[PDB]
């Protein structure tokens, strides 16, 4: 189902997933890689 | 007269000479680290 009011802790889970997958310097590394 | 250097990655020590190319004997690592001085140090604990 949906996240009615535990959204405050649910959004930071996806933020953590993004920054564990990508990182802070994906621009430089991916640009030089391509 | 020879100076003792610590062989970087090897962490072993060896002698060195004047006008001697800087090489370790274990694996020829180029980076040497000079040993700590033998004279006394005294620190005010402040």
């Amino acid at each position: 189902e949906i996240t009615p009011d535990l959204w405050q802790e649910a959004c930071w889970i996806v933020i953590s997933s993004y920054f564990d997958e990508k990182g802070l310097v994906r621009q430089q590394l991916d640009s030089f890689d391509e | 007269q020879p100076m003792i250097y610590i062989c970087g990655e090897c962490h072993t020590e060896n002698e060195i000479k004047s006008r001697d190319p800087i090489r370790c004997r274990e694996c020829g690592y180029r980076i040497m680290y000079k040993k700590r001085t033998k004279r006394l140090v005294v620190f005010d604990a402040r």
């Binding site: 949906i2 996240t3 959204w7 889970i13 996806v14 933020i15 953590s16 997933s17 997958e21 802070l24 | -």
Partner: protein
């Protein structure tokens, strides 16, 4: 909710951010496409029925705090400040002494400023967990008092505690490297390391 359930249990389900991108839940919107998108700020306010504003949302912002940079993310309550103050703090935050790197004992950096007892902030943001500011911090939590006094915190100055400083308060250490090599040349000038 199932996405959150599979996303909390990372390193077990191998459910990454890329899997959520593949699931058609999030997508990357660039600046051209922002001109033709109806963007919800937060879901708890802009999907519930009210005196309706638009009721035609296409995308929703993940979290508004992600509009800020890396140095504006370490500011506690940056929306309560004034914007020039936030800019000046963004300037100063790239200048605070601290453990700039973990292997600083190996690096022969010029002008290495490191600190004795850096601390994580008691008042932190959620975004510091992703800049890893709690692992290589820059600054110490200090018991400040905002008081007029003898007259040495007059015009943008602060009175410090001598005993606290003697207890290692902000006592930093400054490293400076010096490099020099000799030059084998055409025998006219020949540098060599020796005690003169």
């Amino acid at each position: 909710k199932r996405h959150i359930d599979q996303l909390k249990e990372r390193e077990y389900n191998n459910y990454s951010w890329q899997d959520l991108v593949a699931s058609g839940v999030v997508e990357y919107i660039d600046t051209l496409e922002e001109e033709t998108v109806m963007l919800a700020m937060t879901p708890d306010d802009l999907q519930e029925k009210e005196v309706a504003y638009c009721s035609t949302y296409t995308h929703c912002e993940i979290h508004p705090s992600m509009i800020l940079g890396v140095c504006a993310s370490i500011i506690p309550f940056p929306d309560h400040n004034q914007s020039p103050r936030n800019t000046y703090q963004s300037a100063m935050g790239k200048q605070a002494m601290g453990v700039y790197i973990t292997n600083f004992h190996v690096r022969m950096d010029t002008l290495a400023h490191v600190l004795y007892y850096p601390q994580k902030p008691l008042v932190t943001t959620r975004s510091m967990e992703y800049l890893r500011f709690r692992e290589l911090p820059a600054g110490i939590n200090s018991i400040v008092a905002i008081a007029s006094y003898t007259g040495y915190n007059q015009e943008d100055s602060v009175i410090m505690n001598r005993s606290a400083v003697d207890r290692g308060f902000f006592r930093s250490v400054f490293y400076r490297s010096y490099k020099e090599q000799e030059s084998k040349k055409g025998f006219d000038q020949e540098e060599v390391f020796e005690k003169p």
